[PDB]
Structure 1
Amino acid sequence: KGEELFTGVVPILVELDGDVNGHKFSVSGEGEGDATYGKLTLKFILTTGKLPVPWPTLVTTLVQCFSRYPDHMKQHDFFKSAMPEGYVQERTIFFKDDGNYKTRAEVKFEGDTLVNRIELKGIDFKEDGNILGHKLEYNYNCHNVYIMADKQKNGIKVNFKIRHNIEDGSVQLADHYQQNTPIGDGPVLLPDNHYLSTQSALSKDPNEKRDHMVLLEFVTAAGI
């Protein structure tokens, strides 16, 4: 029945507790998701510390329950089926020839609000590398995310490689290893293999003085 929680517009709260090479920071995100259109609109603000990594590196970490699953694919929507109790999302993100993020999040309803509570630890970042040196372009490429069931672990596994464009025409690769597991004991949908097509647009609020990121996404499930 978790699918039914997502028929209209759902308010979203994101809270990120970050520590990258000892540099501590917090980010708060507010907006809303409309899974009917696979649409996310969020504004993220740095609320503690100085931002020691580029905004684009945090996009994947900062709620796939807002994906649009076409009607013929509804039986493959693990993310909504885990709600409202929610799921744990864990990743390791390897930045090629640089450091790594380890993330743990709980995605669940808290009253009527979909909440993404994240802990992020970054280590091994190079001082004059693409991340700590803020050399990534403020943009995002369209990416496909390949979803597989891991039935023996009662969840899903997701591998994918983000390409972050750099001005000089090189790219910073970010290799993602993701697992999602239900929080609840209730039955969830374990999907057939499929992907999510994710389009992301990054912008700025011209009225906002704090370090921030405005994000618009469209996410569509395909490939069954």
Structure 2
Amino acid sequence: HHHTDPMVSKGEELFTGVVPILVELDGDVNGHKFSVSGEGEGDATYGKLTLKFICTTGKLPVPWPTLVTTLVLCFSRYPDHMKQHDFFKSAMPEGYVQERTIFFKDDGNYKTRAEVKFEGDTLVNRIELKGIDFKEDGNILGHKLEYNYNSHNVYIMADKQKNGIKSNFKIRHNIEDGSVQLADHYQQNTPIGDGPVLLPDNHYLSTQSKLSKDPNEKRDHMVLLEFVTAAGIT
């Protein structure tokens, strides 16, 4: 609402209230083609997301928790003293590309590319996902993961050469038998536009996610509440 840096003001202004979100994913995992649509709202003031996702092609062929990181970090809450480090909002409204490779230990990998940008007043995240080399009897295609999600801190670093950011981090998915399925993420983000962006000092994001079901919904779906806060600069 009041920042002495006009570049920060420009990005904050687009995220000042509740912003509607649309998520589209087209996926192919070991030749099972599927699509997911999601709708909800983001409130960057509190770092809060609320989304509901539907598999529009029938039953989702992989477990919903494996898609949480893939299915909008511009809604992170950056403390006032860290707002000059917020790459994600500084790239708006033209947006950014978010690319990942996700390696599931002892199993296959996801390769994702997403464009995150405004269409009018709506923040859209449009994703293509390709998954290969998964085991039919593994934890992913065998749906052995529990329907829950662990809190996680992720380290963000600038990539000055690409005018973007980079991160590598591990997600632990609980398996029904009490064990864990590791998912190693590599991520890079680059701006879509050619204007300047804020390139951050090293810092981390703290995330927490809660998964639930809509008791009146017959389609395969996931309801997601996420909180993300930046930290690590004193």
Q: Cα offset for 1:143?
A: 0.5
For 1:95 and 1:115, the matched residues in 2 are separated by 27
Partner residue in 2 for 1:142: 151
Contact 1:137 1:166 in 2 (8 A): yes
Q: Cα offset for 1:117?
A: 0.2
For 1:177 and 1:115, the matched residues in 2 are separated by 22
Contact 2:85 2:198 in 1 (8 A): yes
For 2:122 and 2:24, the matched residues in 1 are separated by 13
For 1:48 and 1:155, the matched residues in 2 are separated by 34
Gapped regions of structure 1 (runs ≥ 5): none
Residue deviations 1:133-183 (CA, integer Å, cap 9, x gap): 000000000001110000011100011100000121110000000000000
How do 1:1-224 and structure 2 match up within 5 A?
1-224=10-233
Q: Cα offset for 1:3?
A: 2.1
Q: Cα offset for 1:2?
A: 2.1
TM-score by length of 1: 0.99
TM-score by length of 2: 0.95
Q: Cα offset for 1:27?
A: 0.2
Q: Cα offset for 1:49?
A: 4.3
Gapped regions of structure 2 (runs ≥ 5): 1-9
For 2:121 and 2:12, the matched residues in 1 are separated by 14
Q: Cα offset for 1:33?
A: 0.1
Q: How many equivalent residue pairs? A: 224
For 2:58 and 2:41, the matched residues in 1 are separated by 25
Residue deviations 1:102-124 (CA, integer Å, cap 9, x gap): 00000000000000000000000
> Could you say what secondary structure the match of 1:75 adopts?
helix
For 1:43 and 1:49, the matched residues in 2 are separated by 16
> Could you say what secondary structure the match of 2:46 adopts?
coil
Moved over 2 A (4+): none
Identity of aligned residues (%): 98
Residue deviations 1:29-78 (CA, integer Å, cap 9, x gap): 00000000000000000002431100000000000000000000000000
For 2:146 and 2:34, the matched residues in 1 are separated by 21
Contact 1:93 1:101 in 2 (8 A): yes
> Could you say what secondary structure the match of 1:48 adopts?
coil
Contact 2:58 2:219 in 1 (8 A): no
**CA root-mean-square deviation:** 0.6
